[PDB]
Amino acid sequence: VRPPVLVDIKFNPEGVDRVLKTAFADRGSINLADPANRERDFSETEYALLWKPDADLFRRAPNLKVIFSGGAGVDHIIGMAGLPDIPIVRFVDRSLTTRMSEWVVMQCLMHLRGQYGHDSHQRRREWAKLIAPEAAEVTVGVMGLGILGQDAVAKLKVMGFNVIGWSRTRKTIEGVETFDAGELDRFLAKTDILVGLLPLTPETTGFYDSELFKKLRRDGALGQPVFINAGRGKSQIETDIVSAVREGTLGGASLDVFEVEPLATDSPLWELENVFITPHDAAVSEENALFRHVEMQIARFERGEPLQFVIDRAAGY
Amino acid sequence: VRPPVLVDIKFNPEGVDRVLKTAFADRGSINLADPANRERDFSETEYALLWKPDADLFRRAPNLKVIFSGGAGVDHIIGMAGLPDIPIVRFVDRSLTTRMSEWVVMQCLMHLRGQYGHDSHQRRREWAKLIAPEAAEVTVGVMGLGILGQDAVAKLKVMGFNVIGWSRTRKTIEGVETFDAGELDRFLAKTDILVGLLPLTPETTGFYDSELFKKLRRDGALGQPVFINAGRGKSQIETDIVSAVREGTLGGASLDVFEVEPLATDSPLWELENVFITPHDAAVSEENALFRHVEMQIARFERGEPLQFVIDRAAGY
Ligand SMILES: NC(=O)C1=CN([C@@H]2O[C@H](COP(=O)(O)OP(=O)(O)OC[C@H]3O[C@@H](n4cnc5c(N)ncnc54)[C@H](OP(=O)(O)O)[C@@H]3O)[C@@H](O)[C@H]2O)C=CC1
Ligand SMILES: NC(=O)C1=CN([C@@H]2O[C@H](COP(=O)(O)OP(=O)(O)OC[C@H]3O[C@@H](n4cnc5c(N)ncnc54)[C@H](OP(=O)(O)O)[C@@H]3O)[C@@H](O)[C@H]2O)C=CC1
Ligand SMILES: [Cl-]
Ligand SMILES: [Cl-]
């Protein structure tokens, strides 16, 4: 008999309860939201699925073999005291990648084509032809070339954009100029539409700021460059986005993530011209997908195969 | 010395005058907008570039070898009395195809992802996550599989949509179910998002009507099906689009073309929920592109090679 999987995830508790009815069917689960588990024995527990876990979890479950993040991010876990030296697996919803690429391509097209203007005129019953350059005249600079960035690059290229990429270690991608960490300024100077698909680490906290926006290409085919972020909200400085749009440093933005979520009602972003807001719904997983992922990794682990999507502790993502 | 090319195109006359300064540089042009050409001798004229030409042009220029349409469409020419039995070449701006595909993919994504709702909530400072199915769950049915439709199909497929096509003669396209003329009802019943890329002919006049909209798939992943048209406006019955959206037969629409252009200020379409209007600017040619196209076809013709993009007179497009 395999021991049940420990689950401590701060999502809709009623939703989690329901998924867990059919998850882990060979072993069951220990839902830490249930008061009947306040004094549960975790001595045999092998696997823990955690999202914003209780601080003393690792004292209670000292024999864990693998930690599974309940999210795509691991900032919620990585900084915890007493985090054991065991693999931490991030949630890579293999079906979510394509949905992030739908969002990225749509946002880039809406900026390329002038959706903001089209919609403003439509609401005023104004017939107003706009000029847009073809995609090939515009360079999209993708920051982050991991699971999400490499899919976005591929699809943006097919739509016709010139695409360049930036990552901590330079990638090799056919047809796409790619840059190392240290080449940030050069990469920004070539970029008309910046697409952010970075994890949140100390190095990427407050990264998208006034100074960065002033380095984007100023004499490109869109007139003024555009900032797009669907990575993590704490990577950007929103007051600097607001100032940059008002002063014309940025021609617009598309944002799915924010420093504080939900975005405050009084944020200036909501009504800023040429700014598109989605409420962190660009690529949210269907509720079972996390559990299917964890189950699959357990199966690999129990056949003696390598875990996938293991984070690099020293790098922080 | 080759004779100058006859040009009778009802566009901005000042714009046409300017392009013609550098066009046809080995022979010149005869601009019929110029009053100095009211009594010009066209006995030697070989080529005519026409958009909504004068009715007696063919009496004045009886020795024409080739007619070039000034537009992508040829409805403006095809019905004319005394139209000579010589090739008519349509304007296929080889660089416009990719721009039509940008528009089609953007519109399909905006309907897939709920841009209308996102934007409505954003304007009200409301944080409101929406559910959207992945593209693979939605079938886009492309009507017209010519230069524009085949490019749209390819790019929609890469974005992840299921795609099917319909044309007068069935095409063979790998990975895409394709249907013949007579299979329209079956094709409509499988379609969640209809994309119209048909020419205007008698058979396609008033084609997109109430009866057609009621045949689109009703139990699909978008809930209610969507109508998209960027072919010709006279192919649709706008009052039926309005009724279909109000009654819930259509979940929304995207339109670049209209029965009467510009779209009347009082049209209900402007303010209809889930309807996106662009003012016939999805794929408008840069002003020189027409002349470069005509020049290239003349060069082929003068080397004894076949003209390209010749219309099928019996079929009407
Ligand atoms: N808005 C949303 O709904 C969602 C947002 N996300 C967010 O997207 C992020 C990216 O996801 P994913 O692509 O799967 O992540 P990956 O870990 O696969 O890729 C991360 C990329 O970021 C690069 N990177 C990390 N740190 C730096 C740095 N300091 N300098 C330069 N490049 C850096 C990495 O470089 P290298 O390749 O050299 O390692 C890599 O290319 C996630 O961490 C998550 O926060 C995820 C899902 C949904
Ligand atoms: N909104 C805009 O700015 C623009 C609009 N357009 C419009 O787009 C139209 C399509 O352009 P393009 O793709 O280059 O044209 P093509 O002539 O290359 O293709 C036309 C397609 O329509 C199909 N078709 C024609 N009549 C019928 C019919 N009765 N039943 C079923 N299918 C039919 C043809 O079938 P088959 O393959 O069997 O011949 C073909 O697949 C143009 O005619 C023009 O009016 C063009 C450019 C810009
Ligand atoms: Cl964040
Ligand atoms: Cl029309």
mmCIF file of N, CA and C and ligand atoms in Angstrom, chain A residues 200 232-234 258, ligand 3:
data_model
loop_
_atom_site.group_PDB
_atom_site.id
_atom_site.type_symbol
_atom_site.label_atom_id
_atom_site.label_comp_id
_atom_site.label_asym_id
_atom_site.label_seq_id
_atom_site.Cartn_x
_atom_site.Cartn_y
_atom_site.Cartn_z
ATOM 1 N N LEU A 200 9.608 34.756 -11.543
ATOM 2 C CA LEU A 200 9.960 35.717 -10.492
ATOM 3 C C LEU A 200 11.075 35.141 -9.643
ATOM 4 N N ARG A 232 5.283 37.260 -14.243
ATOM 5 C CA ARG A 232 4.877 37.571 -12.889
ATOM 6 C C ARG A 232 4.772 39.074 -12.716
ATOM 7 N N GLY A 233 3.743 39.487 -11.976
ATOM 8 C CA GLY A 233 3.466 40.877 -11.777
ATOM 9 C C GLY A 233 4.552 41.620 -10.988
ATOM 10 N N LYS A 234 5.175 40.947 -10.031
ATOM 11 C CA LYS A 234 6.219 41.596 -9.224
ATOM 12 C C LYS A 234 7.505 41.830 -10.030
ATOM 13 N N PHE A 258 0.071 41.368 -12.286
ATOM 14 C CA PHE A 258 0.169 42.652 -11.591
ATOM 15 C C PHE A 258 0.894 42.491 -10.286
HETATM 16 CL CL CL C 3 4.093 38.248 -8.791
#
